[PDB]
Amino acid sequence: INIDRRRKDIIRTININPTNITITSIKKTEIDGAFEETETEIKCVVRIFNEKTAEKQISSEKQGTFSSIRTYGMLVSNDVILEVNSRDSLEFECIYGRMKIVNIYPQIVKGELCGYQCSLERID
């Protein structure tokens, strides 16, 4: 498979049903054995699609209540480098509860990045 084929396919698939998204990244930086969080905001064109027929979990407790579902995936081009770790997070404000990027699958051809297959979690 050639890199141009993958690039064309990713861009086409995103352009069938794109949505402009405002990713917000909170990166935790170790400072004196604790975290100092630097917040940055980055924008990308994105297509969102169902991937898993999962069930909405609920986690009510004395801290508070929130329900999250794992169904939605995501597919984004090469325009911006992404990364999600324990110390790094990515979220964005979809209208139906803000999404959260759980795991990143970087699509690579011959050691060259071309786009990120990605997974989400719709936090209600």
């Binding site: 609920i58 004395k62 209540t65």
Partner: protein, 91 residues
């Protein structure tokens, strides 16, 4: 009849999300389930319960509680008994 007594409250003020409710358990208790008589063969207890009822104009439940006590009330009971032959003719 019976007479519940307030004792406290459940461990915390729980929240149940699946039922969409909040709950709290009040904790009561009842006394002397088995007793139903309110009588005594201790003549001294009977005498002092009579004295308390006459003087004080409240109940006097004798040697042990009963489940349906009417507050306010008293209770005369014996704890310890010491007999003694002080003399040939006297005890």
């Amino acid at each position: 009849a019976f007479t519940c007594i307030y004792k406290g409250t459940s461990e915390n003020d729980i929240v149940v999300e699946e039922w969409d409710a909040i709950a709290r358990g009040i904790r009561f208790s009842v006394i002397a389930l088995e007793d139903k008589e309110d009588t005594t063969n201790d003549r001294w207890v009977e005498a002092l319960s009579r004295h308390t009822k006459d003087l004080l104009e409240i109940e006097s439940y004798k040697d042990n509680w009963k489940k349906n006590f009417i507050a306010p009330c008293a209770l005369w009971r014996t704890t310890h008994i010491e007999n003694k032959r002080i003399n040939y003719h006297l005890i």
